Design a protein around this ligand. Structure first.
Ligand SMILES: *[C@@H]1O[C@H](CO)[C@@H](O)[C@H](O)[C@H]1NC(C)=O
Ligand SMILES: *[C@@H]1O[C@H](CO)[C@@H](O)[C@H](O)[C@H]1NC(C)=O
Lengths: 75, 120, 495, 247, 75, 120, 50, 75
């Protein structure tokens, strides 16, 4: 969809507010939150996989966060 | 650019709603106020509206009995007078003025909408 | 003979001690069942009607705005109020504009402002729901006889149509000349309509997940509303703009039909114009062949000359079909059909149109047989005018085994644990496997729900790598197996 | 001013004149006369064939479905050269006279037009001398990398690359016949559910999807004259000829 | 929008072609590829960060892939 | 029901397209064939088509000279003749049969479109 | 495969891989060739005209 | 050109004489020989590279022959 390629990060922003800045500011985070609520099974598996792969708490937390954020995204 | 509603007859105890159609520029740039002049008497200011912002102001006498609203989807301002009585028989003009508080320059006036209060 | 010409045909051979067999019927698939002494039958699930659907929510995909009004308070006087903030057919927003002597306040600062516009719907999606007891499955049973009126046809001249419901789930089909077949189906465990919505948008419909339908980011009505005027998430189809701090406007967000189409990828499209017709899904039935008999077993071999009126044509399933006419004297007679080697010393293939018989002289009958891999000869008739037909089958037995295993894996990928009821005849191994699959599928669905196919491939690779770089052999093997199964499922899924 | 059309996308289409053709198994591809015309979005697929549906063979036959793609609503995008880039500035001195304290047109507040044609802009402020402005309208918004995207009485100032990368049917912008849409496959769907039949649908209307995709872009006005109310302008202010009024 | 929650991992898939299945199979991969083409700078930074955070080549590559997949996705 | 287009007068070397609309059920579940009859002569099969599938079959005599097509959106079947001549003057019928290679019973016929190369 | 009063018995995949413009074989129009670019060359020697 | 994909290794040959069997039997060798004559410089470089890369004489000769055959062919 065209909706999958928003005009964010293009470097044309001014002081003027954008098309849906207030709306689209937190919509991705809300989506990831709703998805994690609806699918606790994948979050637990991602936590286990992140703990296993990462040797350090930073690597593990980063892997878990990225897995959780990308699972709905590809979805 | 300040076309008003046609003359309406009313009866005591009822409310008459008058309208003032305004241009796009007038609606967004200027402020409109309502002045009523009962026949044989002097001019009187009821209130005004800055249609872009929408907060209406009213005379001390008409406070609690007059309502002024504007429709941003139509560029119109409506004056609403309730509890009509004999004294309310008058002609109502919708005038134009700048948005500044100190500027009360009524350069543009409405055609005047006579309102009659009598059983008839 | 209906399954001839369908790529997803299945061959089910054998029944249990009770003369029954477990078959799962899918809409795009055909099942042909064979037992030692029974006529060959073709089974097709040709319909699934949902009746008496009830709406549970109407989403707005395209709205308009009218009756826009604004209120504002000069700075430090609190937030403004509009009468329309309590009106449910209005969408409102609170912001701050810049006020001062020029604007008409007398104080300089951020004065609150609120703007409201009436929200109206112009097009909506009605997500109907249906009770699981209102589902009706139509199943056609056609005997694999050879009579010309049924060679791959999708008509009902010879096929028998039996309607199956959750209430009357046991039915029998009277097959003229073959006895009766009893179907003992379980529609309730078929598709679980209590967790699904029938989504009709314009002239197109989909079958969707009810949680997914209830989580949609569009405004909705409960479905009991006859006037609209109480849409819920009206803020999703509008945007309020206060560029700088001089004005506050509100606009609608354009038709959402195409965004809905994009959101509907992975939902199987259904029909909802002339009733709720679902040409997707499966039905598990237990097939009872006990009162099922071959037609014409009390016939004498023909002893005449056959002519091949249509050359032998091979199907996608490794079997062959041949259309032969009869010109002998004993009209109703068993057709002497055999598939042998060149020397006619060994019997190499089995015929699928079991007990071919000529019901009428100048009435072609087309037999289906399964010849062996490589060279084989189809012999039709008796010696006085016997015709011998050479054929060659291109495949291999190892390749056939590989394809059978792949079809089994794909059936498990699509039916999950219901694939253990396909061709089932009881048995303890089947029950143990189905229980194990049920538990493992519960875990797997919990851990992989809502995940796309690329994510499944990535998770499979990650798990396989973890298992391969594992010090313990048991955990290593288990993780490698789970990861490979995950990879196969990700490559097979449409998600 | 004087914008040029860069590309016209399709956000809503209709399909008509649907036709199909099939080839029996092993006999190659089928052919429609409609595949010659670019107004038709065509698709090739395989369909189960046999004696039942009209082939002496029993394999996967070839099928092609064509439909006439027609646009119903456009998302035109336009490009302006930095030369046609008028800027309007208003200079109001801090007096107390108040006539132009809150006014927008003339009076005390003198408004000037800045264009790349003239580097020096001169405003004579009554009683204050002359204010000299040296603005660089070229180094503000990089209009060589921006599109004035107009979709149904709304406009957005978008990145040119982001715009050319949009996945919709489009016309080159030089187009005149308005019928040779390029990416017609992004707005049409082909369905072959069970491998028995192939059909085509026009896949909805993308106005709302575009609205979502324009998140992060600044709305502009393009109904009359392509007005922008976003961005900056760097100017050198010359006070050499500026004098206090009351001195 | 609705387009960002596209009814994929819902577990209701039969042996029948789903709506827009062929397109949606590779649409996200195409989007990621086009984004990586248009934004080479972020990909280099993601590679550097993945190398720094991860010690083993496996988790370095995993971090790089997750970062690259979620960079356009968060948009 | 099977409705055919009206009679057409053509000239030698020209082309005539004959239409044959059909109901939804007969369009998607059957096949449509074209048979001509020159005046005072027997029926001659020209070709047919399974509209759901397309890819018409043509008689050897009309190979390279006829084109049978189906419009799925309008559920109409089209026949086009190229290189019309006097010997091609005849009435053309569209007939419905099952979409199977063995059964050729035209249980439903159109009225028939007559193509003439002379003046009426 | 026959070309001009000559015929050959050729491999099917080889024949389908031939880099020449082709028609489906069910065409009957003989005008919508597939890969015409194999039988033409476009010239832009100096980036002046094509 | 179609001439660059002859109908050679298709496994259809019979006892019957093929289209241009005698003529095309040695055309490749003749063309390679003519090219190696016209371009001695590449042959010397190929010999040097084969000697440098090949550890044993068999490897050197194999590499030299392959380079000399491919050079004309890739043109
Ligand atoms: C909306 O405005 C119309 C005039 O455009 C008016 O007739 C109607 O009463 C209004 N409805 C409201 C304010 O609910
Ligand atoms: C499309 O069909 C219409 C009939 O509905 C016909 O008039 C028109 O000529 C057709 N156009 C094409 C390009 O096939």
């Amino acid at each position: 969809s065209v909706a999958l390629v928003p005009h964010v990060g293009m470097g044309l922003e001014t002081r003027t507010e954008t098309w849906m800045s207030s709306e689209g500011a937190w919509k991705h985070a809300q989506r990831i939150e709703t998805w994690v609520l609806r699918h606790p099974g994948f979050t637990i598996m991602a936590a286990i996989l992140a703990y296993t792969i990462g040797t350090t708490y930073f690597q593990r937390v980063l892997i878990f966060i990225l897995l959780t954020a990308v699972a709905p995204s590809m979805t | 650019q300040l076309v008003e509603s046609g003359a309406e007859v009313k009866k005591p105890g009822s409310s008459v709603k008058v309208s003032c159609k305004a241009s796009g520029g007038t609606f967004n740039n200027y402020a409109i106020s309502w002045v009523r002049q009962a026949p044989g008497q002097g001019l009187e200011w009821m209130g005004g509206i800055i249609p872009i912002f929408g907060g209406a102001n009213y005379a001390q006498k008409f406070q609690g009995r007059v309502t002024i609203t504007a429709d941003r989807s139509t560029s119109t301002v409506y004056m609403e007078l309730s509890g009509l009585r004999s004294e309310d028989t008058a002609v109502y003009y919708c005038a134009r003025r700048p948005q500044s508080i100190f500027d009360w320059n009524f350069d543009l006036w409405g055609r005047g909408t006579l309102v009659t209060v009598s059983s008839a | 003979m209906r399954c001839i010409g369908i790529s997803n045909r299945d061959f089910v051979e054998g029944v249990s001690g009770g003369s029954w067999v477990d078959i799962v019927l899918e809409h795009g698939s055909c099942v042909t069942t064979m037992a030692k002494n029974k006529p060959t039958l073709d089974f097709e699930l040709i319909k699934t009607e949902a009746k008496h659907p009830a709406t549970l929510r109407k989403y707005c995909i395209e709205a308009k705005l009218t009756n826009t009004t604004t209120a504002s308070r000069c700075p430090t006087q609190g937030e403004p109020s509009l009468n329309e903030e309590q009106d449910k057919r209005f969408v409102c927003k609170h912001s701050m504009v810049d006020r001062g002597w020029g604007n008409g306040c007398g104080l300089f600062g951020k004065g609150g402002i609120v703007t409201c516009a009436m929200f109206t719907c112009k097009k909506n999606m009605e997500g109907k729901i249906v009770q699981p007891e209102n589902l009706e499955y139509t199943i056609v049973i056609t005997p694999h006889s050879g009579e010309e009126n049924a060679v791959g046809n999708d008509t009902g001249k010879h096929g028998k149509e039996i309607k199956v419901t959750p209430q009357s789930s046991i039915t029998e089909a009277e097959l003229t000349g073959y006895g009766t077949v009893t179907m003992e189906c379980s529609p309730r465990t078929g598709l679980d309509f209590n967790e699904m919505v029938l989504l009709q948008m314009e002239n197109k419909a989909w079958l969707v997940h009810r949680q997914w339908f209830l989580d949609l980011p569009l405004p909705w009505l409960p479905g009991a509303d006859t006037q609209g005027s109480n849409w819920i998430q009206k803020e999703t189809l509008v945007t309020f703009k206060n560029p700088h701090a001089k004005k506050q406007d509100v606009v609608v967000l354009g038709s959402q039909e195409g965004a809905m189409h994009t959101a509907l990828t992975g939902a199987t499209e259904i029909q909802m114009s002339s009733g709720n017709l679902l040409f997707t899904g499966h039905l598990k039935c237990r097939l009872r062949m006990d009162k099922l008999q071959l037609k014409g077993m009390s016939y004498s071999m023909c002893t005449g000359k056959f002519k091949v009126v249509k050359e032998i044509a091979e199907t996608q399933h490794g079997t062959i079909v041949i259309r032969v006419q009869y010109e002998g004297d004993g009209s109703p007679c068993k057709i002497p059909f055999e598939i042998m080697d060149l020397e006619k010393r060994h019997v190499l293939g089995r015929l699928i149109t079991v007990n071919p018989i000529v019901t009428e002289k100048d009435s072609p009958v087309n037999i289906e047989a399964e010849p062996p891999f490589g060279d084989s000869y189809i012999i039709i008739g008796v010696e006085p005018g016997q015709l011998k037909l050479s054929w060659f089958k291109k495949g291999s037995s190892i390749g056939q085994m590989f394809e059978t295993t792949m079809r089994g894996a794909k059936r498990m990928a699509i039916l999950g644990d219901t694939a253990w009821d396909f061709g089932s005849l009881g048995g303890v191994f089947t029950s143990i496997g189905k229980a194990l699959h049920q538990v493992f599928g519960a875990i797997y669905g919990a851990a992989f729900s809502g995940v796309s196919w690329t994510m499944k491939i990535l998770i499979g690779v990650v798990i396989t790598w973890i298992g391969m770089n594992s010090r313990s052999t048991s955990l290593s093997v288990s993780l490698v197996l789970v990861g490979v199964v995950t990879l196969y499922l990700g490559v097979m899924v449409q998600a």
